[PDB]
Scaffold this active site. Sequence first.
Site, short mmCIF file in Angstrom:
data_model
loop_
_atom_site.label_atom_id
_atom_site.label_comp_id
_atom_site.label_asym_id
_atom_site.label_seq_id
_atom_site.Cartn_x
_atom_site.Cartn_y
_atom_site.Cartn_z
N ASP A 159 37.39 -44.88 -41.83
CA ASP A 159 38.39 -44.69 -40.99
C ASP A 159 38.73 -43.18 -41.18
O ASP A 159 39.99 -42.48 -41.17
CB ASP A 159 39.62 -45.39 -41.76
CG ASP A 159 40.68 -45.56 -40.74
OD1 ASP A 159 40.49 -45.78 -39.39
OD2 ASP A 159 42.01 -45.59 -40.75
N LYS A 161 39.45 -39.90 -39.21
CA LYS A 161 39.83 -39.23 -37.94
C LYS A 161 41.11 -38.12 -38.26
O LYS A 161 41.43 -38.72 -39.40
CB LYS A 161 40.25 -40.31 -37.17
CG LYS A 161 41.15 -41.41 -37.87
CD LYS A 161 42.14 -42.32 -36.96
CE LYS A 161 42.79 -43.60 -37.31
NZ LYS A 161 43.82 -43.97 -36.60
N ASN A 164 44.13 -39.12 -40.27
CA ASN A 164 43.97 -39.60 -41.60
C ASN A 164 43.67 -38.30 -42.72
O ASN A 164 43.23 -38.43 -43.63
CB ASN A 164 43.06 -40.62 -41.67
CG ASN A 164 43.39 -41.88 -41.25
OD1 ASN A 164 44.60 -42.12 -40.66
ND2 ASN A 164 42.68 -42.99 -41.17
N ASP A 177 44.42 -42.74 -45.64
CA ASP A 177 44.45 -44.07 -45.35
C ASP A 177 43.44 -44.86 -45.81
O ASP A 177 42.31 -44.52 -45.65
CB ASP A 177 44.45 -43.97 -43.64
CG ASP A 177 45.32 -45.37 -43.31
OD1 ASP A 177 45.11 -46.40 -43.75
OD2 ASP A 177 46.21 -45.24 -42.39
N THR A 194 38.62 -46.23 -35.00
CA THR A 194 38.94 -45.59 -33.99
C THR A 194 37.44 -45.25 -33.00
O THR A 194 36.54 -44.60 -33.50
CB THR A 194 39.59 -44.33 -33.91
OG1 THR A 194 40.88 -44.69 -34.91
CG2 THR A 194 40.33 -44.05 -32.29
#
Length: 343
Positions: A159, A161, A164, A177, A194
Amino acid sequence: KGSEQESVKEFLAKAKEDFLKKWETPSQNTAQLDQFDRIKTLGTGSFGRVMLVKHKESGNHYAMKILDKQKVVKLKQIEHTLNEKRILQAVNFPFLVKLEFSFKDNSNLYMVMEYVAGGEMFSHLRRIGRFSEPHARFYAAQIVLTFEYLHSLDLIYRDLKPENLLIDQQGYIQVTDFGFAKRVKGRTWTLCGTPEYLAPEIILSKGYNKAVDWWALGVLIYEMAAGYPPFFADQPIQIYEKIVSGKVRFPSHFSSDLKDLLRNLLQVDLTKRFGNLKNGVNDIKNHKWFATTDWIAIYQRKVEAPFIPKFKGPGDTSNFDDYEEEEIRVSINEKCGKEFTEF
């Protein structure tokens, strides 16, 4: 130094043995609600709300996350919540958010988090527009070491990105996250994350692994140096096409060395991807773009940050008008005790 370069394994050994201990028998109820004083309510979401709190015994400040048991069960988030906690409870690294305390009562779950004044990487990147390559080098290096660490404990992050990525009061990074992260030994198949940051293997629906994290770093660097992601379109379906057909046209101002690293990390051939070769992580650390980075000093936090946010978090906090809404009612009878026994 030679053999001192080997001393990295010495920390990793101690890091894993310390992780498992906590991973095997996790902590529970390390605090209780009447040990803190509510200062301000920082924000409210679907899970519940985050409050700035003062630990009465120390006077230290945290961002406590209250999440309604019954509201989680509704949102079908039982698994993420438990997995995030169990990971966070067991994890220990400077560039990761630190779960200081964790507990529950009849009505809701409580995650007491080290409070970090300084926004998301996303919004900050909007402000500046794009970072100079030395700025991006500083952020990359941290994400790299973070990833080295996590992979060691056989954890994909899944995750990565800008949203985060929170910024320290020290200007360093904090990763925030973990709802998606998995302790996977071999390969996994869950589609999540994403679109811009998905490695082709995720999209293709074959199995993937920790290589996927290294792809995302590539995307994340490109964005920090270019001000926009390399694979981007008005539809997710189209974003996929552009990723699988992994042709990456750089901006003009992009360094040839930075180009070399990006073509290496952004590589549809996961047998030809930097991170997944003989030397593993070291290939990325020994690359020409990273010769001017002192990893061990980055780790110490002994590197002067390129920028420090003046977030005014600790004192000005939430303006919160004057007298507003806030009350933490704990039910007479227990609710969802069954679902969160592990917590």
